[PDB]
């Protein structure tokens, strides 16, 4: 019930979404269902959201969009000069 990816500061939006889909896809690969709390950590800031991972494709895309939301907040808050640790906990 845990997944992490480290995103480079210079990352494109496609790269961020790729990381997000890897995290949600790893959570999908345990038969594991429930509220997922996602977090993006960068420097001295952290942002978290909760998305329901229910089993539907639509739940997966919700979780992905929460991850990408948190990630962009982190990169904006650190000026795109610091790596971002994406994590998703179930």
């Amino acid at each position: 019930a845990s997944a992490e990816a480290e995103v480079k500061p210079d990352a494109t939006i496609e790269e961020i979404r790729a990381a997000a889909r890897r995290l949600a896809e790893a959570l999908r690969k345990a038969g594991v269902s429930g509220p997922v709390t996602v977090t993006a950590e960068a420097g001295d800031v952290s942002f978290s959201y909760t998305a329901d991972l229910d089993g539907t494709e639509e739940g997966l895309k919700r979780v992905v969009e929460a991850i990408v939301r948190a990630a962009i907040a982190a990169l904006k808050a650190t000026g795109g000069t610091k790596p971002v640790l994406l994590s998703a906990v179930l």
Side-chain angles (χ1 to χ4, degrees), residues 1-31 33-90:
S2 254
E4 296 181 350
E6 180 185 28
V7 174
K8 264 180 116 202
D10 47 56
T12 171
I13 68 153
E14 272 308 297
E15 278 160 8
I16 304 160
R17 310 203 93 268
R21 295 184 286 239
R22 299 193 283 270
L23 303 195
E25 214 72 58
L27 303 185
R28 263 298 79 219
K29 281 341 168 209
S33 178
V36 175
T37 302
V38 302
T39 299
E41 269 157 341
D44 285 313
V45 303
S46 163
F47 306 86
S48 286
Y49 302 100
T50 306
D52 219 318
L53 193 65
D54 47 18
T56 50
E57 207 162 75
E58 293 83 23
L60 181 127
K61 271 309 164 288
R62 289 197 234 282
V63 175
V64 171
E65 293 301 327
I67 295 157
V68 164
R69 227 195 311 281
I72 298 172
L75 310 157
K76 292 195 300 174
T78 55
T81 62
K82 298 248 190 132
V84 166
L85 174 74
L86 300 187
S87 49
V89 175
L90 177 65

